[PDB]
Amino acid sequence: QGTILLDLAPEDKEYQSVEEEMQSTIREHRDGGNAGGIFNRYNVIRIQKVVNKKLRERFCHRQKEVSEENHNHHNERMLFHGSPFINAIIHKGFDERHAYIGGMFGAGIYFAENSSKSNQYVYGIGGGTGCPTHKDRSCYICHRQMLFCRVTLGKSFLQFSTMKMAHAPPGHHSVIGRPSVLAYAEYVIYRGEQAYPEYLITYQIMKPEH
Numbered sequence: 502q503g504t505i506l507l508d509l510a511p512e513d514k515e516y517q518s519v520e521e522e523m524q525s526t527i528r529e530h531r532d533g534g535n536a537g538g539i540f541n542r543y544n545v546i547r548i549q550k551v552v553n554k555k556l557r558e559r560f561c562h563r564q565k566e567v568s569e570e571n572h573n574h575h576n577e578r579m580l581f582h583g584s585p586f587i588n589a590i591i592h593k594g595f596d597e598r599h600a601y602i603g604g605m606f607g608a609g610i611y612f613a614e615n616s617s618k619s620n621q622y623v624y625g626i627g628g629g630t631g632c633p634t635h636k637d638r639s640c641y642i643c644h645r646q647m648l649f650c651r652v653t654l655g656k657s658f659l660q661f662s663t664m665k666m667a668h669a670p671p672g673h674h675s676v677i678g679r680p681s682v683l684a685y686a687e688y689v690i691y692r693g694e695q696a697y698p699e700y701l702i703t704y705q706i707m708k709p710e711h
């Protein structure tokens with residue numbers, strides 16, 4: 502009736518597959534490292550497969566509705582997600598009702614194909630105040646969490662700013678905010694059921710060597 506978290510052994514292609522997309526999609530942001538910390542690597546501590554019967558039905562049902570509406574193409578993609586509510590999401594699923602609505606963002610649940618971008622949001626908008634214990638946005642101690650999810654994009658509406666809206670334009674099912682002078686892409690959905698929390702990644706950002 503709940504979520505069963507299955508551990509993937511590091512020696513499995515799947516575990517290697519997930520950590521590679523994580524580690525390789527890192528980049529350097531204009532932030533100066535202020536939001537997500539200064540690092541050029543992650544120490545991956547754990548990768549778990551999230552299993553919830555209900556969650557994948559809700560997810561599959563919505564995915565059929567979108568295919569219906571998209572000339573039978575649901576346009577699913579594997580994207581990263583970061584926010585301070587990861588533990589609620591793996592048990593209750595994604596929820597559009599907890600979704601901000603203004604400031605720089607709006608009405609949606611954001612996803613990124615860059616893991617370093619989803620990391621900026623682990624502790625909050627901009628990094629919040631950092632970790633609960635040392636109020637440091639660049640902690641190398643505390644274990645952070647992020648999700649590598651299945652996201653049904655459907656017909657995506659492409660534009661430059663997202664803070665904008667609260668639902669998707671007519672005929673579309675997602676919004677891709679793209680780069681101007683943003684830096685990287687951001688995928689937004691306005692329905693929780695259009696995304697399934699496939700993998701739970703437990704990790705730390707590593708401190709640069711020398």
Ligand SMILES: CC1(C)OC(=O)N(c2ccc(C(=O)Nc3cccc4cccnc34)cc2)[C@H]1c1ccccc1
Nearest residue numbers: 584586589590593595596599601606609610611625626
């Ligand atoms: C900026 C925002 C709109 O972009 C997102 O993708 N956000 C977001 C926030 C919450 C969720 C979410 O699904 N939350 C929750 C789901 C289920 C139970 C919950 C219980 C308490 C809090 N959130 C819960 C999803 C996306 C937002 C958000 C807000 C704050 C920090 C990072 C991200």
Ligand SMILES: [Zn+2]
Nearest residue numbers: 632635640643
């Ligand atoms: Zn800390």
